[PDB]
RNA sequence: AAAACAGUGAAAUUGUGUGUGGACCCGAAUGGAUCGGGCCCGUCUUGAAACACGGACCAAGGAGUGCACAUACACU
């Protein structure tokens, strides 16, 4: 089952992270940015290492599209946190859910 | 004049749109990327995408631009001859003394893949070759053989950048 | 000439229709729902429990505070009702597209009502006296009906 | 039909991505059914759409044109003619780089094939070809 | 008072079948729970979501016009 393996193969070789808000005020949101918390990462400094890097958000339960990329533009706030872009909006039914930061940089025509 | 020109046609001349069409072709062409400059002839590399991730495997050569020509070992671990996108390789410190004698050249490995190729291995003469050099440079040393067999496993409890390789 | 409200071949098939009848538009619908996709026989065997008050006919549209029954609990509801005048009427004609059936050379078996619709037909106009000098509307609201009954591939 | 303006093949596919679908309504066309969607500016003392309310819809205006350069041009990349009449085609034969021709709708059966032969062998683009004369 | 063609046959409203939702609109999306913003219009009024008035629903009809007399402007 090429599922089981696919997760196993990205397990390996990725660092983790999860989704959890859109950008936003106190009063509107913006939809076309997400907020990731990547999993040992706890200041500003360290975080800067990772502006640029890839990012997928892989779904097996799709009938669409198995896998989402994306790349992450900037940090946000002081305590390790990171704003990033994808190929296509986040609905807000995926937040709470697992990101993989794939150790290699691209550009962003390319997401 | 014929009345159905002298009022529709009348909205725009048109033979201004070739100018329009060039600069709006500019705008939307791609960003160059860069070719790197860390890698050596013989460094062993971890390959982060596609079928082969998580496996070591030996850097050979540059191809066509950012694409690159790499071989694992198809005795030691079963991997054969590919190309693949410069950027989708983990450097290491390890340097192998290997020198090859021609070009050659093999199938990509895409980011996007349907199925395993759990059967159908065969071997060409240069793969047999290129082998039966590798080799050499590993069967003197000591824990090499085994190294290339094992995957690589990141660090689940510490930042990736804190760790060297 | 007639276009039924759906596409069934002729064949295996057997039919009728009437219009403006004088049974009560409301009252009609309620029975036709509750012996769709019946076998004929069933429903016919059905039909004359209710006739002599032994079973019912439950309501779901068309029943507001209307009485609770022992014998809706069949359905699975509370609330149900005896329309004597369209179960006579109803009874009648599926009994005669058995006939049609038997003369036809499909089987008396086998036959389940797979299309029946019932739609409203134009008012008829009447009056009632008031007080104070006032005339108000006293007004019968008639029906149309269709039925296709079809043999079992089984 | 599958067909582009040669000018515009590397670059149509930008042009229609990029164009807008958005509708404006009539305020509370979407209430009663005796208003129709078609626009009319409300003009009400205390109305939430006029006075540009957060949440209300938005209206109308000379910032949402298109420009010049673009404006009119059909999917295929050319900018569309009427025609009627053999004689009509005649008009086109300076300017069938940029233009295609769009027969009406009454022209009949018979005629139509006069058009699309002549049509042939000039070397002008028809968007109605298939039209009713598909039997 | 109503009532033309034994033409065409819209909307309100009803039944049956198939789909999508629990008043609805705008912005943004998912395989899937939804997220953010929005009080009912018209009108008099310093001030209306109002415990101010008119409005059950659909079609069709429905309100700055003509002449005379001086006048300022534009055009011949």
Redesign the interface.
């Known amino acids: 089952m090429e599922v089981i393996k696919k997760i196993e193969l990205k397990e390996r070789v990725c660092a983790k992270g999860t989704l959890y808000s859109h950008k936003r005020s106190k009063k509107n949101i913006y939809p076309r940015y997400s907020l990731i918390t990547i999993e040992n990462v706890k200041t500003r400094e360290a975080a800067m290492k990772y502006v640029g890097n890839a990012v997928e958000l892989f779904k097996p339960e799709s009938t669409k599209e198995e896998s989402i990329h994306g790349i992450i533009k900037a940090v946000h706030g002081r305590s390790g946190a990171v704003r990033a872009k994808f190929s296509r909006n986040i609905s807000p039914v995926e937040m709470g859910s697992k990101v993989y930061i794939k150790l290699y940089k691209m550009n962003e025509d390319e997401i | 004049?014929?009345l159905?020109?002298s009022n529709?046609?009348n909205?725009?001349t048109?033979?201004?749109?070739?100018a329009?069409?060039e600069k709006?072709?500019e705008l939307?062409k791609?960003?160059p990327?860069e070719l790197r400059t860390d890698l050596v002839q013989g460094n062993v590399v971890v390959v982060?995408?596609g079928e082969y991730?998580?496996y070591r495997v030996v850097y050979l050569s540059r191809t066509e631009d950012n694409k690159a020509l790499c071989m694992g070992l198809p005795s030691i671990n079963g991997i054969g001859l590919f190309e693949i996108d410069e950027?989708?390789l983990?450097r290491t410190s390890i340097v192998l003394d290997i020198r090859l004698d021609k070009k050659y050249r093999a199938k990509e490995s895409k980011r996007s893949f349907?199925?395993?190729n759990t059967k159908e291995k065969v071997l060409t003469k240069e793969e047999n070759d290129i082998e039966e050099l590798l080799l050499k440079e590993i069967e003197n040393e000591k824990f090499m053989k085994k190294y290339f067999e094992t995957?690589?496993?990141?660090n689940?409890?510490?930042?990736?950048?804190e760790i060297n390789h | 000439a007639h276009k039924y409200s759906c596409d069934i071949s002729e064949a295996t098939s057997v039919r009728s229709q009437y219009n403006n009848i004088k049974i009560k538009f409301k009252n009609t619908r309620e029975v036709c729902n509750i012996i769709k996709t019946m076998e004929l026989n069933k429903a016919i065997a059905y039909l004359n429990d209710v006739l002599r008050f032994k079973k019912c006919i439950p309501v779901f549209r068309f029943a507001k505070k209307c009485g609770r029954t022992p014998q809706a609990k069949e359905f699975g509801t509370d609330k149900g009702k005896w329309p004597v005048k369209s179960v006579a009427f109803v009874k009648k004609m599926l009994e005669d597209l058995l006939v049609e059936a038997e003369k036809k050379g499909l089987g008396t078996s086998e036959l389940v009502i797979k299309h029946i619709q019932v739609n409203q037909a134009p008012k008829i106009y009447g009056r009632k006296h008031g007080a104070f000098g006032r005339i108000k509307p006293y007004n019968k609201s008639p029906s149309h009906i269709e039925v296709i009954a079809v043999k079992r591939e089984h | 039909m599958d067909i582009v303006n040669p000018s515009l093949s590397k670059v149509i596919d930008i042009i229609n991505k990029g164009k807008s679908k958005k509708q404006f309504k009539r305020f509370q066309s979407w209430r009663v059914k005796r208003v129709s969607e078609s626009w009319r500016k409300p003009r009400g003392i205390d109305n939430r759409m006029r006075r540009k309310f957060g949440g209300a819809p938005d209206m109308p205006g000379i910032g949402y044109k298109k420009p010049n350069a673009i404006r009119f041009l059909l999917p295929n990349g050319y900018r569309k003619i009427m025609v009627a009449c053999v004689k009509d085609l005649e008009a086109l034969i300076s300017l069938n780089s940029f233009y295609c021709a769009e027969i009406r709708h009454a022209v009949g059966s018979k005629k139509r094939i006069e058009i699309l032969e002549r049509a042939e062998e000039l070397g002008i683009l028809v968007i109605n070809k298939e039209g009713k004369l598909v039997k």
Do not use: G
């Not at chain 2, 689940?156 to 950048?161: A, C, I, L, Q, R």
């Open positions: 004049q014929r159905n020109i529709i046609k909205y725009y048109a033979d201004d749109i070739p329009f069409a709006l072709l939307h791609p960003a990327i982060l995408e991730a998580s950027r989708f983990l349907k199925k395993f995957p690589y496993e990141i689940n409890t510490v930042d990736f950048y």
